[PDB]
């Protein structure tokens, strides 16, 4: 049996590492494991009955140093309302806006949101929107194990309350939020150190009900191909 299929079984929960940045400064980090996904809110007030795990972004500061911009940050957090919903349905991650803050997203690197390609689009409000497809990710991951392509991107960056910072430093934006499906961080890491020969390495898939995985490089590449053949493609 393929242990990597555990990611795509219904009822299983991925871990989402949420990291928030106010003006190029990390202010918040929390890991969420919820079946109905997460929900980036700013605590006003609110509808407690809304599905998804509430992730409250912290209030900024009331400092004489940095207040001409922290009032703007607090202004954005006051308009998140229902917040930014992010959940998983099968092999897709879905994001939707429930508040009044226009939000732009992109699947980029972990230490840098804006590479140059621009945003992958804006988080929709009236409909749910696909932000990540596991299909193309595994395919690119196999090619990465096959010493050819580059490392596939898995980090979801969100630019809240402002337009996407293209050709501008991302430290200028008021509210930036990085969300990482920690299973994908592991899969990439497993392919980063594991590709030494046919030895064993250990990968924690970081998902609900799962044990560590001691696999060989060939075994890992075999499971990945078997994972692909059992997924929808476009």
């Amino acid at each position: 049996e393929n242990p990597l299929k555990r990611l795509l079984v219904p009822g299983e929960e991925w871990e989402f590492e949420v990291t928030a940045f106010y003006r190029g400064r990390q202010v918040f980090q929390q890991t969420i494991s919820c079946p109905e996904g997460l929900r980036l809110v700013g605590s006003e007030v609110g509808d407690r009955t809304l599905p998804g795990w509430p992730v409250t972004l912290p209030d900024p500061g009331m400092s004489l140093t940095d207040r001409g911009v922290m009032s703007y940050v607090r202004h954005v957090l006051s308009c998140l309302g229902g917040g930014l919903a992010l959940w998983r349905a099968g092999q897709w991650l879905w994001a939707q806006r429930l508040g009044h803050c226009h939000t732009y997203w992109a699947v980029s690197e972990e230490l840098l949101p804006n590479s140059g390609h621009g945003p992958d689009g804006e988080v929709p409000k009236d409909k749910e929107g696909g932000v990540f497809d596991l299909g193309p990710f595994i395919v690119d991951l196999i090619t990465f194990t096959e010493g050819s392509g580059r490392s596939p991107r898995y980090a979801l960056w969100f630019c809240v309350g402002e337009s996407w910072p293209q050709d501008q430093p991302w430290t200028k934006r008021l509210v930036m939020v990085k969300v990482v499906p920690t299973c994908l961080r592991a899969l990439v890491e497993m392919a980063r150190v594991g590709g030494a020969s046919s030895l064993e390495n250990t990968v924690d898939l970081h998902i609900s009900n799962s044990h560590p995985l001691s696999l060989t490089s060939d075994q890992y590449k075999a499971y990945l191909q078997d994972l692909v053949e059992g997924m929808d493609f476009q």
Partner: peptide
């Protein structure tokens, strides 16, 4: 440093 808040109300 000016800020255009894409906050859509009403």
């Amino acid at each position: 440093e000016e800020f255009e808040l894409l906050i859509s109300n009403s």
